[PDB]
A paper describes a structure:
VASHs were first identified as secreted angiogenesis regulators, and predicted to harbor a transglutaminase-like protease fold. The identification of VASHs as major tubulin-detyrosinating enzymes establishes the nature of molecules that start the detyrosination-tyrosination cycle, and this helps to extend the understanding of the tubulin PTM in cells.
After purification tests with different fragments of VASH1, a catalytic core-containing complex VASH144–315-SVBP1–66 was purified to homogeneity and we solved the structure of the heterodimer at 2.28 Å resolution by Pt-SAD phasing (X-ray statistics in Supplementary Table S1). The final refined heterodimer structure contains residues from 60 to 304 of VASH1 and residues 25 to 53 of SVBP. The catalytic core of VASH1 adopts a mixed α/β fold comprising seven α helices, six β strands and a 310 helix. In the structure, SVBP forms an extended α helix and is wrapped by VASH1 α1-α5 and the loops among them. In the structure, VASH1 and SVBP form extensive interactions, burying a surface area of 2256.5 Å2. However, structure analysis revealed that the sidechain nitrogen atom of H204 is actually hydrogen bonded to the carbonyl oxygen atom of L226. The VASH1-SVBP electrostatic surface has a conserved, large positively charged region stretching from the active site toward the β1/β2/β5 region and the loop linking α3 and α4 (L34, named similarly hereafter). Through structure-guided mutagenesis, we identified that K168, H204, Ser221, R222, and the L34 region are important for the detyrosination activity of VASH1-SVBP. Disrupting the VASH1-SVBP interactions significantly reduced the activity of VASH1, which might be stimulated by the interactions from SVBP through stabilizing the active site of VASH1.
Author numbering:
A (entry chain A): 60 to 304
B (entry chain B): 25 to 53
The structure:
Amino acid sequence: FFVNRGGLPVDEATWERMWKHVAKIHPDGEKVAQRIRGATDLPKIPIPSVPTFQPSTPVPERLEAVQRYIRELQYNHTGTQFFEIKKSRPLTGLMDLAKEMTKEALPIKCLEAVILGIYLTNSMPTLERFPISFKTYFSGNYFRHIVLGVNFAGRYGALGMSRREDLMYKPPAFRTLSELVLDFEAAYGRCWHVLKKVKLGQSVSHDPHSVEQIEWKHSVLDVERLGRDDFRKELERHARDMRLK
Amino acid sequence: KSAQQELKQRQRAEIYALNRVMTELEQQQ
């Protein structure tokens, strides 16, 4: 998973590196490059339209539309991340990045989807947004994932992008934050991953010009050292911390 | 300017063809 630095269009070096990565990863890799590179019969991809909402549309319907747009961008399986995301940047820089993502319309992954969800829900002041990071373990390897937890009318859901359907979108129907996180943990266990750490952030400002930073790791929960009851207690403590601004 | 738009269009089309190929590969193996 290389990261494209230098913006779009992809520079010659990053383009060649992406194609070399493809040639080594994919069997038929250089045949793949030979078929695709320079081809004149490739499909035209329509630029997906950014959803806009009537004031009468309920927020959960808007969330469905936003998740649909994010999915339409497609999950990035090319091995080259096309947008560099510096997580410590001020909000307004990340929002400019999300706007450029909407204008250039390329495949994305976990963190790009989180930033896009923040950018696309800034118009919903009754909706709170906060990042949720997962660190899991499988077959001697550690894995990291992130979604945008969401809160509306006292119920929790999520937006995001993931390889698996049960590791991204959750409609805002979970009555407590712990139930949402435990649903994610159940999906992880279903795909034979052990959940090690959960990192929950504070609410993100709805001001796209804000210079504040996203507070990614307001609560870092070691699942195994906490146990069930203390895990739930800490998740509810984070929920309280959030709803008290 | 206008040539850079054609550049971005060609690159995006190739990126999505490649992404389809790699998505099929990954969903298999």
